Design a protein around this ligand. Structure first.
Ligand SMILES: O=C(O)/C(O)=C(F)\C=C\C(=O)c1ccc(F)cc1
Ligand SMILES: O=C(O)/C(O)=C(F)\C=C\C(=O)c1ccc(F)cc1
Ligand SMILES: O=C(O)/C(O)=C(F)\C=C\C(=O)c1ccc(F)cc1
Ligand SMILES: O=C(O)/C(O)=C(F)\C=C\C(=O)c1ccc(F)cc1
Ligand code: NA
Ligand code: NA
Ligand code: NA
Ligand code: NA
Lengths: 283, 283, 283, 283
């Protein structure tokens, strides 16, 4: 499987979106799992999940790696509402366009917020819910905010440079030996390719700050079986939010990886794939 | 598999133990996994692990459900050192007697302390380490101590009664509908059968209080791959100790079950069995 | 100062209350500080605050120790809304009847919930806010709920006995040597005197469970300078809620007493009095 | 009081130190309080405590603002042992030279580690103990380490620049409006004045990493009445260490300031001065 061989586009039409182009990477043909990426500059479906797509497909799932609005190859957009909710509407739009009745969702960070909003807004359209360090869940009981990683994300959006990208990735990942030339060059290309997405993201963030994303008060509504993962060493979203979700969602479990930053599905891909595939099969 | 069909005895000889009788339940014939029980009145190997032995054996392991010294059908003993260490010596004694070179250890509560001590004292004799709410790891950052469950455990040791047993089990388990007549009658029988074990436990606890069990300072020595589990709703050992282990052991992960008390391997047996078998196979 | 010499009654009329009798103990004549008690069986203003009234009066404050509706010498009531809000309406009713424009509030547990609700509903009527382990602020990130102390409070309400009272006080206080015959006899008398309050409390709790009390989502509205205290060893309301308040209220500080249960103003009266008087004077 | 008018030097002789020059600022003449500064580049007694010296002197204390070895105007040194212990020996050396029998200690960060080590090593020479975010107390249960602030401290030591200083101060303080030209210029001067201290600090840190500073296991030995303060928003030492100290020291209390970074005695000087003076007077 490659980015090119799996690449597809679909126009969506859903509450606010009109003939809006969504890019996604699709492989496999079984039960649908939609994987939703984080909000960093240059983020996208393939780049965030390419270590996961193969094993999930091998396990018999149809995997859709979705580019959220205003990221990668999806259409440019300025959002005046919190991104989790707007992104969730776009997932629903994609599912309607592709005739998908129910999907399992996997979401990291912004994608975790998207998945939570989707579960809240469209409970009859979700199977299981997999959350990796979801963002926007209000204050931490321990971590000063904005967190270290978030400050760097905003620096890189506002003043993109190769050096600042490197600094961000050093904070993003626990094991520094994972920061290869390939990773750096690839992430730098995606930032250079879409400067309009960078500008639009910053405008959107002024209109709807991270405080507007907090859906904590509604977590008791979630009826989906939920698997929460966290990196022990995540400098972007606070570990105690893993506990917040575990206490507030009816049927959840929490798995914390040691020696792991903000990209658990990539930093601990083998363990992540095994645990999440087992969850989808047996929970 | 039944208690009777799996029941075996072996005399051990190891640092302090001389021709000391250990009872254990054995099934299967592959790689050895020794499962170590908690310290409540009437506790033992079979009673604590009978929902786990079958699936582990099916997975190809040889399972040994060990009765710790001063419990169930093992010999009576008064201990003047912390139980985790004394119990670990007894595991080594059993392995030497049975010609077992290396074992995976699974330990709940007192059994978790036993397993940690074993990993520290005999690192060349352990494979992987599975810890379910290990006891004795010092103060909690949040929970007043002694914890609610521990107060009840001491009440039941000192004044055993059917009513006090019921009260303890209500705190021990999250889902009250798991407290069947069978569970109550069985636990009551094991308490009635061995009053000397109750008396000896209390004498031992005066000689070596829970504060003597704390091996926190040595956790950096543990080289075993470690899987830590906790019940979210454990009223016997504090949830934050799961974090303590995760930060201090080199190669660990933490899994927390929602709606789960102090007997995770029984209350969430299916998920526990799947996760731990996968860990032993693939980690 | 004695209970008898300070005892006063006033009829209140405020949203739901019609000619409703409120008992209070008053001393001093300066700036008004209203102290609000917890929700345990037999609780009241004088009993909960008699170690505080003198020093506050000496410092130049007018101290009002209010009996909440359905407690001690105030009128009996069955509440169908969360007690914090209903109690707050009663404080407003008292202040209107006594021609008090603004008051500083001190509230422990239920009284802390009352004080938070008062600050939210009537921001122009509050000076400073002092909270000692306020109750009803949703789940803990660490403590299983209901907490140990709360289970005992409900046991004592439903089946009042001298032995159960003693058990509750043992959990309520850290230092067991504070449980004198005087304390026990006094608390037992207040329970015996008002069996109707016990029955009504339990009916009220069925109509509006503790989950209905949670005002967390509104804490950002509080503009009062706030001093939060917690007992390190509080088995009734969880320590992490001290952090919740500290992160969510604009201008707060948190003080945690070691070796202290659920009655900090009594268990650490000297330090409590000094800190709170300094706060009222200088903050 | 000014830096110049209070400036004194004394040669010390104590376990490893031979005719070693210590600079300190002294004012007042009552009971001695020694204030101990943090470990950032350019740190010193006067600079760290000039908002505290006046009120403590007014309260009747003799205040000694000590420059630790290898800082400000004290002699240059390369340390091969953990700085807390070496610094404590230097405090003892100063007290012996000045004929001071007992001192109250106030210590922030490195100075908090110094004060803890002093209490452990010389219990008969300490009065009360005041700790503001002490450093080196092992891992956090929540914060990835090294913490954000610590990474910046090491960057500034290794590559001192005006821009990096500004970045560090932005993380060091919660309220950005406290970063005046005066603060920046002053801190920059102290860095420019003593480049040898910067180089020596880095050599020392290689010889004895922060892990060597951890005295957690010995906290039960501390018999001094202890007052622990923390900034809620401290990005240099983790908030949960405030809890660690509170649970492990016999007689402690914890006060947490909201809207406060790593320099609580300066950022919340009025409240800090009032609380600590009251503690010294009445505890
Ligand atoms: O995971 C990524 O792709 C990435 O580069 C990120 F930095 C993701 C971070 C978030 O999406 C994020 C959103 C919201 C929040 F509160 C915290 C973090
Ligand atoms: O799991 C059991 O069998 C049981 O009945 C227990 F209550 C086990 C508890 C412990 O072994 C225990 C030991 C030490 C400790 F600190 C806390 C709990
Ligand atoms: O402080 C008392 O008077 C007392 O006897 C109590 F047990 C008070 C407890 C509460 O008011 C309480 C209310 C709500 C809650 F969530 C937890 C505790
Ligand atoms: O407070 C200061 O003067 C300062 O500039 C600091 F950054 C102090 C920090 C420490 O001394 C420090 C030491 C050890 C540690 F683990 C964490 C922080
Ligand atoms: Na490499
Ligand atoms: Na049943
Ligand atoms: Na006494
Ligand atoms: Na200014």
């Amino acid at each position: 499987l490659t980015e090119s061989s799996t690449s597809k586009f679909v126009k969506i039409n859903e509450k606010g979106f009109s003939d809006f182009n969504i890019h996604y990477n699709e492989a496999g043909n079984g039960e649908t799992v939609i994987m939703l990426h984080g909000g960093g500059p240059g983020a996208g479906g393939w780049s965030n999940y390419y270590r996961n797509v193969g094993p999930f497909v091998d396990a018999g799932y149809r995997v859709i790696l979705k580019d959220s609005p205003g990221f990668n190859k999806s259409d440019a957009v300025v959002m005046d509402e919190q991104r989790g909710l707007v992104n969730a509407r776009a997932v629903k739009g994609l599912m309607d366009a592709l005739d998908i009745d129910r999907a399992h969702l996997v979401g990291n960070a912004m994608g975790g917020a998207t998945a939570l909003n989707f579960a809240l807004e469209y409970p009859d359209r979700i199977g299981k819910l997999i959350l990796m360090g979801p963002g926007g869940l209000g204050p931490s009981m321990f971590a000063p905010m904005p967190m270290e990683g978030i400050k760097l994300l905003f620096k890189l959006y506002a003043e993109p440079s190769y050096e600042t990208l490197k600094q961000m990735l050093q904070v993003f990942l626990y094991d520094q030996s994972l920061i290869t030339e390939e990773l750096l060059q690839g992430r730098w290309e995606a930032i250079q390719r879409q400067p309009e997405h960078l500008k639009n993201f910053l405008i959107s963030a002024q209109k709807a700050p991270l405080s507007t994303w907090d859906v904590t008060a509604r977590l008791g509504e979630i009826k989906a079986k939920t698997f929460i993962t966290w990196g022990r060493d995540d400098r972007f979203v606070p570990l105690d939010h893993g506990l917040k979700l575990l206490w507030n969602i009816d049927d959840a479990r929490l798995h914390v990886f040691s020696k792991c930053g903000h990209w658990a599905q990539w930093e601990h891909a083998d363990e992540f794939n095994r645990l999440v595939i087992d969850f989808l099969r047996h929970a």
